[PDB]
Amino acid sequence: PELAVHLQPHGAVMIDRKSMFYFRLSGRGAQLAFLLSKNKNLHKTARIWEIMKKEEMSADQLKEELSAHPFTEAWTEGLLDQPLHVSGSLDSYLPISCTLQLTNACNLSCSFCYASSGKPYPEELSSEQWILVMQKLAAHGVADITLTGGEAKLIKGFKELVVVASSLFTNVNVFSNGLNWRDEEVELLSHLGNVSVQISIDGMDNTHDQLRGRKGGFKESMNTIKKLSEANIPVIVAMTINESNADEVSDVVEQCANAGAFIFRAGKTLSVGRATEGFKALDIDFEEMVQIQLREARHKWGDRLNIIDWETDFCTPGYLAWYIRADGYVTPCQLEDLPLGHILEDSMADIGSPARLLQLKCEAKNCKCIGKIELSEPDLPFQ
Amino acid sequence: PELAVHLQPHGAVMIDRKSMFYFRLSGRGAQLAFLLSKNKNLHKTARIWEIMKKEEMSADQLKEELSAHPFTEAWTEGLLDQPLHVSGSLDSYLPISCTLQLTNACNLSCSFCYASSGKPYPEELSSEQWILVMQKLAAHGVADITLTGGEAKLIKGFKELVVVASSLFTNVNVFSNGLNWRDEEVELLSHLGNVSVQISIDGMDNTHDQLRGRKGGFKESMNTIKKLSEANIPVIVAMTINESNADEVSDVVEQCANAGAFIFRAGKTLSVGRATEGFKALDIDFEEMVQIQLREARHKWGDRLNIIDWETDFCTPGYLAWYIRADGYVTPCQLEDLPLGHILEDSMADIGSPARLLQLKCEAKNCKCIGKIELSEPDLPFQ
Ligand SMILES: C[S@@+](CC[C@H](N)C(=O)[O-])C[C@H]1O[C@@H](n2cnc3c(N)ncnc32)[C@H](O)[C@@H]1O
Ligand SMILES: C[S@@+](CC[C@H](N)C(=O)[O-])C[C@H]1O[C@@H](n2cnc3c(N)ncnc32)[C@H](O)[C@@H]1O
Ligand code: SF4
Ligand code: SF4
Ligand code: FES
Ligand code: FES
Ligand SMILES: [Mg+2]
Ligand SMILES: [Mg+2]
C-alpha cells in the first residue's frame, strides 16, 4: 500500500492510495499511526505516549488496542513503515478523488446520456487549463483521477493531458465509449502503467448498437476492450441497464470475460439529462432478472472477472470526491449540476466550504447519495 | 532519500526531504522525473516521451541526458523508485522549511539577542494554535521544522507540540540555550527519532557565562549536550562570535567533540535586536582568527565532528523558507520583522504572494540574503 492521512474538518481518514480503500481514523488512532510511521517501533511509540499523555501504555497494550480492527492490526506488522503522505485541511473539505469532464463533445448522442453529451459547451477548459487544474489537485492530495466526458479523449491535447494525469496521480481511469481508439493511444496508456479504461457495453451486438445509435458500435468497442487488455491495461466494462438489455447481462459478461476485461459493473439508468424524457424506472421484474444473471455469471466467470454486486472505497460525494465539469464548475457528483464552486475562479478552500456542503446536501435533487450522508461525531487528531 | 517535487510560480524543485538537499528542475527534467517514478523504466519512459512529444528518444539518449548531472544520473539507478510527494503552487510561493518562534520568553536575556527575548509578547500563539499551524504547513508540503524562541521549550504544552512536529515533518530541530533540560524531555526526543537539538555555546566557561549572563551556564549547557548525545540525539552547537570569544573557537570545538556533538557552526553577531546597541562589526583580524581555528579544528576533530565552513540545502528566505513569529506574523527570515502575512489571519496562498516577495526583497533591511536572490528564468513543468 501507498498510505496517506487526509485531514478533514471533523476528523481524518487513512487512505491506501493504490486501492483507494480508506478508513475513518479516531483522533487517538491518527496520532498512533503517525508515531508508528516515524519510529516504527511499538515499544518506542508506547513510551512516547506515556511521556506526552501521562497515561500508562505498554507495547502489549498498544498491540492489543490496534488488534481491535484488521486494518489497524496491520500497523503492528509494519504496514506504516513507508513515509505517510499528509494532506487536507481542518477548515474545508478537500477531495481525495476527482472526476474531470474534459469535454462534453462526443461522437455518439445516446438518448439516455446523463450529461446530454455530443456538442461541447461553448466554453470548455483547454487541455492546458486541465493541466493547471491537475497540478493544483495533486498538490492538495487528490490521489485518484477519472477522465470522462463526453468522450474524454476527443479533447485536443489528450495525450499530453493523460501523461500529466498518470504522472501526478496514483491511479488514472479513462472513460470511453470504446470507439475510435488509435494504436499509439493504446501503447501510450500501456506504458504509463497506472491508467485503467472503463468501456460502456449496453447489450449484445444488436441491442447495444440500437441503444447507442451506432451500427457496428458493439463490435468496435469489444475490439477496443480486447486491444486494451492485450496491452495489459485493466479494463472495466460498464453496462447501463434498461428494459431492452436486462436479459442480455450474462451474454455480455461472457463477451467481456473472453475479451480480457478485469471488472464488469451493471448499473441502473438514472433519470438525469436526456434520460428524463420518457423515463420509466426499472420495474422489479427487470431488476431481479439482472440479479439472477449476475449471480450465475459469478459462478461461471467469477474466476476470470470481478463481477460487481448490483447496487470502504466509495468516496463520499462532495466531502471526499469532486466532479469537475467541462465548464469548470465543481459539483459533488457527475449527476449533479448544483455547484460547490468553480475550479479556476474560486480557491480550493472556498470550494470545500462546510456550510455550502450542508446546503447542497439538503438541496441536491440528482445526486441521491449526498442527501443520505451522515457525518461522524467530530474526532480530530491532536485534540 | 525521501523525494518530493515542490511546484513554484517560476519552476519546480526536487527535494530530498531527509537531507533537505534540493535541485532546481528544468520543466523537461521534472516531466521525466515524474515518468520515471511511475513506470520505473528508462525504455518505457523514453517511448512515452516519443509518443506524447513527437520527438525521438531512446533509452540510451535518455540515460545520457540524465547522466549530465550527478543527481539526475541517480534517476537512472532507481533513485525515483519510491512514491514522489507532490506539493506547492503555480500561483504562490509556499515554503519547504519553516522556523517557528514558539515564544519570546527566555530564562536568559543576552545583550546581543536578535529576538530581544526574555519576556513573551503580550499575545502569543498557544501550543494548540501551533498544532493547528503545523497541520496546515505539513498539508502544504513543508518538510522541515525548527522550533525556536526565546527558549522554545518554555511554551506550555511543549511535549505535545514537539510530538506533533515529529509526527508531521520529516525533520525537527529544537533550538535551546541548553538550560533546564529534564530527563523525560531527553528521553522523549530520543524516542521520537527525527528530532535534533541546536545548543548555543559562546565560549569556554568564563567567557560564555559572562556573555550569557549566567554563572554556571556553560557547565549546564555542556552537560545537556552530553546527555542529548548519549541518548543518540544529533546535537548541533552554534557559537556566535564577538571580540571576546573569537580566540576560544578551537577550545570550544574540542569540548563539543568530547561531549558528542554532531555539528559545530560558528557565525557572526549581527546588528539586529539588542545587538544594535553599541554594535561593532567583527574586524578583519578577529574574522581571520576564527578561520584559522576552524581550519585547525577540522584537521584535528574533523573525523568526529562536522565543522561548518565560515560564512544546495540553503532554503531561500521567503521563497522557500518562512519564519513564523510568536505573534503569528510570517517573515522571510528570523532576522526580519517585515511581514509576508499572518499565519492565522491570512491564507497560505496570500502569504506567499509573488508581488509581496518582490516588495520585501527590495525593502528588507535585516535579512541580507533576500535582497541578493535572483530568480531563475521561468521554466515550468508541463509547459
Ligand atoms: C457519460 S458516459 C462518458 C464516457 C463515455 N462516453 C461512455 O459512454 O462510456 C459515463 C457512463 O455513464 C453512463 N450513463 C450515461 N447516461 C446514464 C444515465 N442516464 N444513467 C446511468 N448511467 C448513465 C454511460 O453509459 C457510461 O457508462
Ligand atoms: C534567538 S536564539 C533562540 C534559541 C536559544 N534561546 C539559544 O540561544 O540558543 C537562536 C540563535 O541565535 C543566536 N543569536 C542571538 N542573537 C544573535 C545575533 N545578534 N546575531 C547572530 N546570532 C544571534 C543565538 O546565540 C542562538 O545560537
Ligand atoms: S453515454 Fe457516453 S457515448 Fe453516449 S452520448 Fe453520453 S458521453 Fe457520448
Ligand atoms: S540568544 Fe537565546 S538564550 Fe539568549 S536571550 Fe536570546 S533567546 Fe534567550
Ligand atoms: S455519488 Fe451522486 S448519486 Fe451516488
Ligand atoms: S536568510 Fe535572512 S540573513 Fe540569511
Ligand atoms: Mg430487444
Ligand atoms: Mg576575555
Side-chain angles (χ1 to χ4, degrees), chain A residues 1-17 19-55 57-59 61-63 65-81 83-118 120-122 124-155 157-158 160-225 227-295 297-298 301-302 305-310 312-364 366-371 373 375-376 378-383, chain B residues 1-17 19-55 57-59 61-63 65-81 83-118 120-122 124-155 157-158 160-225 227-295 297-298 301-302 305-310 312-364 366-371 373 375-376 378-383:
Chain A
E2 181 177 320
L3 296 172
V5 174
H6 192 70
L7 304 178
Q8 307 178 300
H10 71 292
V13 300
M14 186 175 281
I15 308 141
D16 172 12
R17 289 178 48 128
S19 68
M20 292 301 294
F21 168 78
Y22 69 89
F23 175 78
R24 167 72 50 190
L25 290 161
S26 65
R28 175 180 178 99
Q31 296 178 66
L32 292 169
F34 282 119
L35 283 161
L36 286 167
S37 77
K38 284 280 161 53
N39 62 66
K40 307 184 189 183
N41 185 282
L42 279 294
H43 290 78
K44 296 279 189 281
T45 289
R47 182 60 188 144
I48 290 160
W49 195 263
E50 290 192 325
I51 296 171
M52 175 267 169
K53 291 293 187 204
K54 273 83 190 73
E55 148 192 346
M57 177 186 282
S58 69
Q61 288 171 320
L62 179 52
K63 186 179 304 185
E65 176 176 354
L66 299 172
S67 300
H69 185 283
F71 188 83
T72 56
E73 181 171 26
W75 303 356
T76 75
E77 300 152 2
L79 199 71
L80 305 180
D81 282 1
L84 193 48
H85 184 81
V86 174
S87 59
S89 170
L90 298 182
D91 301 311
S92 68
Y93 284 94
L94 296 172
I96 64 174
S97 182
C98 294
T99 295
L100 311 185
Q101 188 196 33
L102 298 186
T103 183
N104 211 33
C106 190
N107 54 313
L108 302 183
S109 49
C110 310
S111 67
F112 52 82
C113 183
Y114 75 74
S116 306
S117 303
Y121 297 148
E124 296 184 336
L125 271 64
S126 66
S127 61
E128 292 86 0
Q129 290 174 300
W130 282 119
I131 287 167
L132 294 177
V133 167
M134 285 189 289
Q135 288 165 273
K136 176 174 286 187
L137 297 179
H140 283 79
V142 175
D144 191 85
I145 286 286
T146 297
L147 307 177
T148 192
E151 179 68 15
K153 79 184 192 313
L154 284 173
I155 191 174
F158 179 72
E160 304 99 302
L161 187 156
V162 76
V163 171
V164 176
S166 166
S167 290
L168 294 185
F169 300 96
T170 299
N171 319 296
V172 179
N173 178 258
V174 175
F175 223 133
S176 178
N177 57 32
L179 304 175
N180 304 316
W181 275 79
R182 303 163 67 99
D183 285 358
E184 89 278 349
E185 291 171 339
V186 173
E187 187 183 1
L188 176 64
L189 271 62
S190 183
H191 294 330
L192 285 168
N194 65 333
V195 185
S196 303
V197 178
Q198 198 159 174
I199 301 292
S200 297
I201 301 295
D202 283 340
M204 296 296 296
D205 308 59
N206 291 334
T207 296
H208 173 100
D209 287 0
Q210 181 272 305
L211 286 167
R212 297 251 151 188
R214 174 64 73 92
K215 197 185 182 194
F218 173 94
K219 187 177 303 300
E220 182 168 356
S221 297
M222 288 304 316
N223 193 231
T224 295
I225 293 167
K227 287 171 152 47
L228 292 166
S229 300
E230 287 176 347
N232 301 314
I233 296 160
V235 178
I236 302 95
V237 176
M239 180 176 182
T240 299
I241 297 295
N242 51 56
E243 289 192 358
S244 301
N245 64 16
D247 64 339
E248 301 185 17
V249 169
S250 69
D251 286 353
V252 170
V253 172
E254 175 176 38
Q255 298 295 302
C256 295
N258 292 345
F262 179 55
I263 291 168
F264 175 88
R265 190 185 74 253
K268 294 184 174 170
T269 300
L270 311 172
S271 183
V272 179
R274 288 198 288 260
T276 65
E277 185 65 56
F279 183 80
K280 185 203 196 305
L282 198 63
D283 74 30
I284 194 65
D285 287 358
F286 287 100
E287 186 163 2
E288 294 295 338
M289 176 180 306
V290 173
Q291 292 172 343
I292 171 96
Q293 286 170 93
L294 293 175
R295 292 197 291 271
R298 291 189 200 92
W301 310 105
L305 176 65
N306 181 12
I307 294 153
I308 300 309
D309 294 319
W310 178 249
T312 179
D313 72 338
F314 172 69
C315 289
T316 63
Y319 289 91
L320 283 169
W322 286 355
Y323 176 67
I324 310 190
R325 298 159 46 93
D327 61 9
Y329 282 97
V330 180
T331 89
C333 172
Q334 66 196 34
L335 299 181
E336 188 49 69
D337 56 7
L338 217 52
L340 291 176
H342 189 282
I343 197 64
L344 305 179
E345 297 169 15
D346 298 328
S347 69
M348 294 287 288
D350 281 354
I351 297 168
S353 160
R356 177 65 177 174
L357 273 165
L358 272 197
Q359 165 178 31
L360 286 213
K361 175 179 175 164
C362 67
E363 293 171 17
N366 286 317
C367 178
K368 301 304 181 185
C369 299
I370 192 173
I373 291 309
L375 295 189
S376 49
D379 185 7
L380 288 164
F382 322 119
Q383 278 181 32
Chain B
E2 181 177 320
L3 296 172
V5 174
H6 192 70
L7 304 178
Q8 307 178 300
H10 71 292
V13 300
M14 186 175 281
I15 308 141
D16 172 12
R17 289 178 48 128
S19 68
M20 292 301 294
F21 168 78
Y22 69 89
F23 175 78
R24 167 72 50 190
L25 290 161
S26 65
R28 175 180 178 99
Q31 296 178 66
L32 292 169
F34 282 119
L35 283 161
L36 286 167
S37 77
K38 284 280 161 53
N39 62 66
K40 307 184 189 183
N41 185 282
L42 279 294
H43 290 78
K44 296 279 189 281
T45 289
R47 182 60 188 144
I48 290 160
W49 195 263
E50 290 192 325
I51 296 171
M52 175 267 169
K53 291 293 187 204
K54 273 83 190 73
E55 148 192 346
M57 177 186 282
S58 69
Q61 288 171 320
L62 179 52
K63 186 179 304 185
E65 176 176 354
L66 299 172
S67 300
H69 185 283
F71 188 83
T72 56
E73 181 171 26
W75 303 356
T76 75
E77 300 152 2
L79 199 71
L80 305 180
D81 282 1
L84 193 48
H85 184 81
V86 174
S87 59
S89 170
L90 298 182
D91 301 311
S92 68
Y93 284 94
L94 296 172
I96 64 174
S97 182
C98 294
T99 295
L100 311 185
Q101 188 196 33
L102 298 186
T103 183
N104 211 33
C106 190
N107 54 313
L108 302 183
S109 49
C110 310
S111 67
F112 52 82
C113 183
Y114 75 74
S116 306
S117 303
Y121 297 148
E124 296 184 336
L125 271 64
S126 66
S127 61
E128 292 86 0
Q129 290 174 300
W130 282 119
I131 287 167
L132 294 177
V133 167
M134 285 189 289
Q135 288 165 273
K136 176 174 286 187
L137 297 179
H140 283 79
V142 175
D144 191 85
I145 286 286
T146 297
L147 307 177
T148 192
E151 179 68 15
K153 79 184 192 313
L154 284 173
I155 191 174
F158 179 72
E160 304 99 302
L161 187 156
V162 76
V163 171
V164 176
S166 166
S167 290
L168 294 185
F169 300 96
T170 299
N171 319 296
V172 179
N173 178 258
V174 175
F175 223 133
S176 178
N177 57 32
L179 304 175
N180 304 316
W181 275 79
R182 303 163 67 99
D183 285 358
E184 89 278 349
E185 291 171 339
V186 173
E187 187 183 1
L188 176 64
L189 271 62
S190 183
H191 294 330
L192 285 168
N194 65 333
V195 185
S196 303
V197 178
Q198 198 159 174
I199 301 292
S200 297
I201 301 295
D202 283 340
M204 296 296 296
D205 308 59
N206 291 334
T207 296
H208 173 100
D209 287 0
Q210 181 272 305
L211 286 167
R212 297 251 151 188
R214 174 64 73 92
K215 197 185 182 194
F218 173 94
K219 187 177 303 300
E220 182 168 356
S221 297
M222 288 304 316
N223 193 231
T224 295
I225 293 167
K227 287 171 152 47
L228 292 166
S229 300
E230 287 176 347
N232 301 314
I233 296 160
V235 178
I236 302 95
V237 176
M239 180 176 182
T240 299
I241 297 295
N242 51 56
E243 289 192 358
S244 301
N245 64 16
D247 64 339
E248 301 185 17
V249 169
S250 69
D251 286 353
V252 170
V253 172
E254 175 176 38
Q255 298 295 302
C256 295
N258 292 345
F262 179 55
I263 291 168
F264 175 88
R265 190 185 74 253
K268 294 184 174 170
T269 300
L270 311 172
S271 183
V272 179
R274 288 198 288 260
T276 65
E277 185 65 56
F279 183 80
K280 185 203 196 305
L282 198 63
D283 74 30
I284 194 65
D285 287 358
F286 287 100
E287 186 163 2
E288 294 295 338
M289 176 180 306
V290 173
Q291 292 172 343
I292 171 96
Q293 286 170 93
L294 293 175
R295 292 197 291 271
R298 291 189 200 92
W301 310 105
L305 176 65
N306 181 12
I307 294 153
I308 300 309
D309 294 319
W310 178 249
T312 179
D313 72 338
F314 172 69
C315 289
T316 63
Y319 289 91
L320 283 169
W322 286 355
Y323 176 67
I324 310 190
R325 298 159 46 93
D327 61 9
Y329 282 97
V330 180
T331 89
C333 172
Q334 66 196 34
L335 299 181
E336 188 49 69
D337 56 7
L338 217 52
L340 291 176
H342 189 282
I343 197 64
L344 305 179
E345 297 169 15
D346 298 328
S347 69
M348 294 287 288
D350 281 354
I351 297 168
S353 160
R356 177 65 177 174
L357 273 165
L358 272 197
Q359 165 178 31
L360 286 213
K361 175 179 175 164
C362 67
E363 293 171 17
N366 286 317
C367 178
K368 301 304 181 185
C369 299
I370 192 173
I373 291 309
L375 295 189
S376 49
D379 185 7
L380 288 164
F382 322 119
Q383 278 181 32

Coordinates of all heavy atoms in Angstrom, one line a residue, chain B residues 314-315 317 332-335 366-370, ligand 6:
Chain B
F314 N 20.5 25.3 1.5 CA 20.1 26.6 2.0 C 18.7 26.9 1.4 O 18.6 27.2 0.2 CB 21.1 27.7 1.6 CG 20.6 29.1 1.9 CD1 20.5 29.5 3.2 CD2 20.3 30.0 0.9 CE1 20.1 30.8 3.5 CE2 19.9 31.3 1.2 CZ 19.8 31.7 2.5
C315 N 17.7 27.0 2.2 CA 16.3 27.3 1.8 C 16.2 28.8 1.7 O 16.3 29.5 2.7 CB 15.3 26.7 2.7 SG 15.2 24.9 2.5
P317 N 15.3 32.5 1.7 CA 14.3 33.2 2.6 C 13.1 33.7 1.8 O 13.3 34.3 0.7 CB 15.1 34.4 3.2 CG 16.2 34.6 2.2 CD 16.5 33.3 1.7
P332 N 10.3 36.5 6.0 CA 11.2 35.6 5.3 C 12.3 35.0 6.1 O 13.0 34.1 5.6 CB 11.8 36.6 4.2 CG 11.1 37.8 4.3 CD 10.5 37.9 5.6
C333 N 12.6 35.5 7.3 CA 13.9 35.3 7.9 C 13.8 35.6 9.4 O 13.1 36.6 9.7 CB 14.9 36.1 7.3 SG 16.6 36.1 8.0
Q334 N 14.4 34.9 10.3 CA 14.4 35.1 11.7 C 14.9 36.5 12.1 O 14.6 37.0 13.1 CB 15.1 34.0 12.5 CG 16.6 34.0 12.3 CD 17.1 32.7 12.8 OE1 16.5 31.6 12.7 NE2 18.4 32.7 13.3
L335 N 15.7 37.1 11.2 CA 16.3 38.5 11.5 C 15.3 39.6 11.1 O 15.6 40.7 11.4 CB 17.6 38.6 10.7 CG 18.7 37.7 11.1 CD1 20.0 38.0 10.3 CD2 19.0 37.7 12.6
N366 N 17.0 43.9 7.3 CA 17.7 43.0 8.3 C 18.1 41.6 7.7 O 19.2 41.2 7.9 CB 17.0 42.9 9.6 CG 17.0 44.1 10.4 OD1 18.1 44.7 10.6 ND2 15.9 44.5 11.0
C367 N 17.2 41.0 6.9 CA 17.6 39.8 6.2 C 18.5 40.3 5.0 O 18.0 41.0 4.1 CB 16.5 39.0 5.7 SG 17.0 37.6 4.7
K368 N 19.8 39.9 5.0 CA 20.7 40.3 4.0 C 20.6 39.4 2.8 O 21.0 39.8 1.7 CB 22.1 40.4 4.5 CG 22.4 41.4 5.6 CD 21.9 42.8 5.2 CE 22.1 43.8 6.4 NZ 21.6 45.1 6.1
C369 N 20.1 38.1 3.0 CA 20.1 37.2 1.9 C 19.0 37.5 0.9 O 19.2 37.3 -0.3 CB 19.9 35.8 2.4 SG 21.3 35.2 3.5
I370 N 17.8 37.9 1.3 CA 16.7 38.0 0.4 C 16.9 39.1 -0.7 O 16.5 38.9 -1.9 CB 15.4 38.3 1.2 CG1 14.2 38.1 0.2 CG2 15.4 39.7 1.8 CD1 12.8 38.2 0.9
Ligands
FES6 S1 18.2 34.2 5.2 FE1 17.9 36.2 6.2 S2 20.0 36.8 6.5 FE2 20.3 34.9 5.6

